[PDB]
Structure 1
Amino acid sequence: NFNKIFLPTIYSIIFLTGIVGNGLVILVMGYQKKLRSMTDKYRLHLSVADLLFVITLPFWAVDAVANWYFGNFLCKAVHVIYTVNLYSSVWILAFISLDRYLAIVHATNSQRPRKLLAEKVVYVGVWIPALLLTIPDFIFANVSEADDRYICDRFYPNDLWVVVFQFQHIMVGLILPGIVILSCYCIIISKLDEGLRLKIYKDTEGYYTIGIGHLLTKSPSLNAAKSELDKAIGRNTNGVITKDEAEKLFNQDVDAAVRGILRNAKLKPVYDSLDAVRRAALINMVFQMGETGVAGFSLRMLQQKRWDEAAVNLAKSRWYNQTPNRAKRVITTFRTGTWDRKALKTTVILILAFFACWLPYYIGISIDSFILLEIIKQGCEFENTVHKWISITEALAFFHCCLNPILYAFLGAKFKTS
């Protein structure tokens, strides 16, 4: 009878650490609009989905120890809230995988629909279908007099319905979101202006070129051009070159054009004052215009460490109109950085921890599936202990509601003092 001691303790912890945890998130998210990334818009939805559930936990605690005093309406309410929290939380995490797929795989053109998903579809795809999935809780969940106490849960006409709702749970809860999440990160891990071409091509003017804009020869002869760049790598290739070979050739194109920046006195106090990322943006500008071209700028502002003042000044040139998309990237690189890892890790460890909480519960249910479907035929003492290890794992699983705020803790905090 010790389930009165285990379960109400575990339920009390999640309600207390969840009301404070998820409570702070919703409160802080509303306090400011300036600092809001796409993942932070989704993590707010996750907080509302979890707060709504954590508040129903004291009812779960009382029901474990004593009785369902709350009535028939509140028996329907807690089950409905359990169905919303179950499918929404997992599907919001499926959208965070979808958002991460768009933010990295579509580097350039991404924010365009990333907002469409986060603010518009996030309801059509997550809130509207999850609330529709609660329909059986309204029909089936009911209070009934189990011997000596009022029992409250889903009661169906037959035991076949248990399977219709267990299969549906595995489908919408774990198999379908699991495919989406595992697809997104599978694309992310494997896949992680001037253009890259691994086979010989003619440029805007018809000269033989290969890799990131490297020029072989202005001679119209096919074989004479190949042999002029067969000796640049050190192999008989007949054109076609590897990705790492092109990276070395681009590095040789930079390493030779990067020496010229250090010799030209007009931009050398500008390039040196520039940190790494902004330093590379000027080199990206050099390959396009040339050392004399770029040194005619919008440069006295960039060296003085005046960021936004030089950025708007560069946008008042002809290079801004000649190459519109190609120039905007360069200008934004001076203002900020490599925005054309830590954020990817936070969501990866959030999704990995979400299925970690739910892993001991999955194992439990998987055993009953074999019990009802007659795969394992151990009597009644064994099944009595399988069920004894479902409620504990389900309670332990609920800790997932504390994963989202726990990852927001110690944000910007310097772990230095001892």
Structure 2
Amino acid sequence: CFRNFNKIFLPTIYSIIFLTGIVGNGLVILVMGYQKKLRSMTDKYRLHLSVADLLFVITLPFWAVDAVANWYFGNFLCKAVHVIYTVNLYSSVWILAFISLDRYLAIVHATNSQRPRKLLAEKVVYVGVWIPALLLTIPDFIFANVSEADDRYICDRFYPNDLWVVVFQFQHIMVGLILPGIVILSCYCIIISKLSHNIFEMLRIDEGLRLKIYKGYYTIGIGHLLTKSPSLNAAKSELDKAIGRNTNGVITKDEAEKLFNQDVDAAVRGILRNAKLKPVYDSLDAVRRAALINMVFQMGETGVAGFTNSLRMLQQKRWDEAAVNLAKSRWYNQTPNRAKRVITTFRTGTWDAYKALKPTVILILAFFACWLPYYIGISIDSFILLEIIKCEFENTVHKWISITEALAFFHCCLNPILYA
């Protein structure tokens, strides 16, 4: 086979990203870099991400000049462009891994374990993400050179065997996607598990945990209504029907968690069906979502849906207005302290009655979305390389790899785009 339809259209893509990326990241480093005021730890990591992108976007006119006609830059700049691309390739994804780590420490070890969150943001990021990637750039400092093949000069990495190619193109999948990707997905699974337990701890304080059958109808665990029927043996049959064994009126703390988690999912599925509740729950955050779930566990789907003004105020982020409006209700004088805690939870968004993770989820997912078509492409090239699929299809796939790598560069002008 042999190695240009998208080569005068492709340089416009580097230019769009250079113009958006330089202006975008430039004003972020202008705002963040010289400011002292409102700094959640993720903003410090975002500055590291913005500086990494800014350094790399400066390299884009070179990519565009190389794509249009030639490489007039020389030996040193061929190495520099290649080293700046590698540092931005590894640091970016690893900054998101350190951002995901920060979230794990913020949700799981909030008070349980003092911050190492300060150390990762102030010092570790330099020698744990910056320096390794700055040293991983060494094979590109010498193997990347200027070729004077035809009157047209080609600047790229010239290794010696191919067996040197796959060992580095595996190092790229490992350090670039496998190692940081695991960290991010681990945090995203540990959090949602130990965050849907805070709902247990919130409702244990409010509804109460009873391991034996109590009443005013027959009840078990975190307020699980078994039957309205005036018969204890009928309550046993309803208990054994949805738990497994013939328990006989007594359950345990660990197995009580499961029963409650089933009622949480049933209420969540119900909220996602209610015309009034569905948009509000989708608008709210984890803690404020749990405060609304708490209300469904007490009033019910219809009971919550009734609070027209407050639900609209919760949907529109008007916290103090929603809390004041909710205080002027039937519920606030029915259960003064349970409503006091829930209202103040809706007011602040914290567990202070006993930290936003949502923009982080968007940032990582958008980065994953940017690089996804390139990963879809690169795999097919590796599939044809191993002789799994079969020359016209080979060079046409290479074409999409060129455009997807350039469309993936949009990840640079996104961290600044996130501030909407």
For 1:322, the equivalent position in structure 2 comes to 334
Q: Which region of structure 1 is more displaced relative to structure 2, 208-217 or 344-353? A: 208-217
CA shift, 1:351, in A, is 0.6
Cα deviation digits, residues 21-76 of structure 1 (max 9, x gap): 11111111123222000111111111011111011000000000111101100000
Cα deviation digits, residues 102-138 of structure 1 (max 9, x gap): 1111232355111122222111211011001101111
Cα pair distance change 1:188/1:240, threshold 3 Å: farther
Q: Which region of structure 1 is more displaced relative to structure 2, 305-314 or 175-184? A: 305-314
Q: Which region of structure 1 is more displaced relative to structure 2, 313-322 or 192-201? A: 313-322
Cα pair distance change 1:371/1:241, threshold 3 Å: same
Separation (CA, whole Å) in 1 of partners of 2:251 and 2:224: 13
Correspondence 1:334 to 2:346: yes
Identity %: 99
For 2:239, the equivalent position in structure 1 comes to 229
Indicate which of 286, 306, 313 corresponds to 2:325.
313
CA shift, 1:219, in A, is 30
TM-score scaled by length of structure 2 = 0.66
For 1:414, the equivalent position in structure 2 comes to none
CA shift, 1:11, in A, is 0.5
Separation (CA, whole Å) in 2 of partners of 1:331 and 1:359: 42
Q: How many residues align?
A: 403
Q: Which region of structure 1 is more displaced relative to structure 2, 185-194 or 330-339? A: 330-339
Cα deviation digits, residues 324-350 of structure 1 (max 9, x gap): 99999999999966155x821211111
CA shift, 1:213, in A, is 15
Cα deviation digits, residues 294-320 of structure 1 (max 9, x gap): 999999999999999999999999999
Please say if residues 216 and 225 of structure 1, whose CA atoms lie closer than 8 Å, have aligned partners that are also in contact.
yes
**Matched position secondary structure for 2:146:** strand
TM-score scaled by length of structure 1 = 0.66
Gaps of 5+ in 1: 409-417
For 1:36, the equivalent position in structure 2 comes to 39
Indicate which of 396, 399, 406 corresponds to 2:410.
399
Cα pair distance change 1:166/1:304, threshold 3 Å: closer
Cα deviation digits, residues 249-298 of structure 1 (max 9, x gap): 99999999999999999999999999999999999999999999999999
Please say if residues 230 and 236 of structure 1, whose CA atoms lie closer than 8 Å, have aligned partners that are also in contact.
yes
Separation (CA, whole Å) in 1 of partners of 2:407 and 2:48: 22
Please say if residues 25 and 47 of structure 1, whose CA atoms lie closer than 8 Å, have aligned partners that are also in contact.
yes
Separation (CA, whole Å) in 2 of partners of 1:223 and 1:374: 68
CA shift, 1:5, in A, is 2.1
For 2:69, the equivalent position in structure 1 comes to 66
CA shift, 1:368, in A, is 1.6
**Matched position secondary structure for 1:209:** strand
Q: Which region of structure 1 is more displaced relative to structure 2, 314-323 or 348-357? A: 314-323
Residues 14-413 of structure 1 aligned to structure 2 (within 5 Å): 14-110=17-113, 112-191=115-194, 240-241=250-251, 338-339=350-351, 343-377=356-390, 380-408=391-419
Cα pair distance change 1:48/1:190, threshold 3 Å: same
Separation (CA, whole Å) in 2 of partners of 1:47 and 1:101: 22
Please say if residues 103 and 110 of structure 1, whose CA atoms lie closer than 8 Å, have aligned partners that are also in contact.
no
Larger Cα-atom Rg:
1
Cα pair distance change 1:101/1:259, threshold 3 Å: closer
Separation (CA, whole Å) in 2 of partners of 1:267 and 1:351: 28
**Matched position secondary structure for 1:197:** strand
Q: Which region of structure 1 is more displaced relative to structure 2, 257-266 or 153-162? A: 257-266
Q: Which region of structure 1 is more displaced relative to structure 2, 17-26 or 105-114? A: 105-114
Please say if residues 103 and 111 of structure 1, whose CA atoms lie closer than 8 Å, have aligned partners that are also in contact.
no
> Alignment RMSD, CA only?
9.4
Cα pair distance change 1:30/1:392, threshold 3 Å: same
CA shift, 1:4, in A, is 3.1
CA shift, 1:370, in A, is 1.8
Cα pair distance change 1:373/1:269, threshold 3 Å: closer
**Matched position secondary structure for 2:243:** coil
Gaps of 5+ in 2: 195-204
Separation (CA, whole Å) in 2 of partners of 1:272 and 1:142: 52
Separation (CA, whole Å) in 2 of partners of 1:272 and 1:119: 34
Please say if residues 105 and 115 of structure 2, whose CA atoms lie closer than 8 Å, have aligned partners that are also in contact.
no
Please say if residues 262 and 268 of structure 1, whose CA atoms lie closer than 8 Å, have aligned partners that are also in contact.
yes
Q: Which region of structure 1 is more displaced relative to structure 2, 290-299 or 248-257? A: 290-299
Cα pair distance change 1:320/1:53, threshold 3 Å: farther
Separation (CA, whole Å) in 2 of partners of 1:247 and 1:291: 22
Please say if residues 357 and 397 of structure 1, whose CA atoms lie closer than 8 Å, have aligned partners that are also in contact.
yes
Separation (CA, whole Å) in 1 of partners of 2:351 and 2:271: 24
Please say if residues 285 and 358 of structure 2, whose CA atoms lie closer than 8 Å, have aligned partners that are also in contact.
no
CA shift, 1:373, in A, is 2.1
Cα pair distance change 1:324/1:156, threshold 3 Å: farther
Please say if residues 3 and 64 of structure 1, whose CA atoms lie closer than 8 Å, have aligned partners that are also in contact.
no
Cα pair distance change 1:355/1:291, threshold 3 Å: closer
Cα pair distance change 1:25/1:208, threshold 3 Å: same
Please say if residues 8 and 67 of structure 2, whose CA atoms lie closer than 8 Å, have aligned partners that are also in contact.
no
CA shift, 1:215, in A, is 20
Cα pair distance change 1:90/1:279, threshold 3 Å: closer
Separation (CA, whole Å) in 1 of partners of 2:262 and 2:48: 49
